[PDB]
Amino acid sequence: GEIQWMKSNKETGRLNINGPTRTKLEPSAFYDVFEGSKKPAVLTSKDPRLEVDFEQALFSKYVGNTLHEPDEYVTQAALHYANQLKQLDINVNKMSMEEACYGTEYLEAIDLHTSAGYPYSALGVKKRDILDPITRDTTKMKFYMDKYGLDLPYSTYVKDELRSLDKIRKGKSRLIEASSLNDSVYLRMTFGHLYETFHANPGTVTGSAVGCNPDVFWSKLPILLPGSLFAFDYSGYDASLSPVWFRALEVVLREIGYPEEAVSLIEGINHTHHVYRNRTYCVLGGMPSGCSGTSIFNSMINNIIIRTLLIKTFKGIDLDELHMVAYGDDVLASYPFPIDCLELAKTGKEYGLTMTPCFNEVTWENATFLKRGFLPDHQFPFLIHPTMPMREIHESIRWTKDARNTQDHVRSLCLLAWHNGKEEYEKFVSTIRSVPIGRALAIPNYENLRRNWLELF
RNA sequence: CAGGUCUCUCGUCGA
RNA sequence: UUCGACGAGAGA
């Protein structure tokens, strides 16, 4: 992905989208008793902690484009993935606007607690001023889709969140491309049922982990991915995607029977306009993260990428012998034979992909997925714990958006940490008990946590 | 008053 | 066990 041009809003006529510059994160009741080095991200170029120029850092991720267009390897990869998807019988029909707006069983209603995007926010219209969970009315929605059309620009904002200390001085905050309500509605209408299918089917048919629950999914993976394991992460996945991957995504959607009217929306996300503050810019390539279907499309593309890199790098691959699941850029995969990932990553560079783990042999003992390790339980080794490092839980507990959430916050971290074992857990709970606010919390005991988890099977 | 698309899990109030 | 509204945490 590559920024094509960037121009004044006075020159493009776009209303300006200016978000808040101050963080909602503040030191928690446990800032003092736990060690950590993450801080809230830089949100303005004025930030004292900055050691670089902000806006060049913010946009440095768009590292250009390479292939615009499938070679035969991309093409066979896309069709193998698309053929796999056929067993799901995805309904390529349009969703009503009412379903796109207000939800179904496997499609959540549009989130009424977040911005309505360009132009509404600059105009002071909120989603809840257009959509209504009780009436379930869509005439106000249709009116505004008529008034402002489709293919509106994405409102860029900096994500308020913790980052590593390295990424503070280097202005390496992450961007949110807020979707306009109009585009959310239209991409939900045309792809709602695909979303429904992917949400109801985490696994190795969709090749997607969206909708999994690591507590029980981790024990399912060694069955789902038999044979030898490989994996990697990517440097700046969404911004590194060249248009060829969006043209492959269109082949896949075509093969499962979408009409061209639907398939060509994908070009409307491979080619995008964004409004950051007072200036407009335009990107070719690259997934706009806040867009509808972004996690699903990124995972589909990832299935295309892996297959493409398999058959271009080695002779005599049988794609039908590949198992994989992706969650965005995160990949876990298996093949009857060990796969040289250093070689794969190299091929990935020929397509603009910067892929990252030396190339250690991937084992269940060292693999990670969704930032969790894998650790067979001692009593029952056919049941696998998702392990989250204690450093990350320590970093989390030192901050708060509202002291009213301490119990929920600390409870949620307890359910993540215990998988690291009784010793590490009791040390965690004990530090929490070392401040008065810690002593007031309801904290489960490891044995209860372990028994509850054991009973899930 | 603002700051995306989502998943899971937990909690609070109901059925 | 299941379903709705709201809040939270982690992950993508």
Give the DSSP letter string of A19-54: ---S-S-EE-TTTTTS----EEPP-STT-TT--S-H
Enumerate the nucleotides of strand C whose atoms come under 7 Å of any protein CB: 1, 5-12
Count of CB atoms situated within 10 Å of the CB of A358: 5
Question: Residue A161 CA to nucleotide B15 C1', Å?
Answer: 37
Q: How does A379-405 read in b/e, with b if 16+ C-beta sit within 10 Å?
A: eeeeebbbbbbbebbbbbbbbbeeeee
DSSP code for A420? G
Nucleotide C11's nearest residue (CA vs C1') is A370
CB of A401 under 7 A from strand C? yes
User: Token digits for A159?
Assistant: 């994500």
Q: Which residue intervals of chain A bear CATH 1.20.960.20?
A: 371-457
Kindly report the CATH class assigned to A371-457.
Answer: mainly alpha
Count the residues in chain A. Answer: 457
Strand B contacts in A 372-431 (CB under 7 A): 407-408, 411-412, 415
Q: Which CATH number fits domain A213-242+293-363: 3.40.190.120, 3.40.718.10, 3.30.70.270, 3.30.2350.10?
A: 3.30.70.270
According to the entry, how was the structure determined?
Answer: X-ray
H/E stretch holding A214 reads helix A214-224
Q: Which residue intervals of chain A bear CATH 3.30.70.270?
A: 213-242+293-363
Contacts (Cβ under 8 Å, ≥6 apart) of A48: none
User: Token digits for A396?
Assistant: 């989390």
CB of A456 under 7 A from strand B? no
Q: How does A148-167 read in b/e, with b if 16+ C-beta sit within 10 Å?
A: eeeebbbbbbbebebbeeeb
Is residue A329 a known part of a binding site?
A: yes
Resolution of the experimentally solved model in angstroms: 2.5
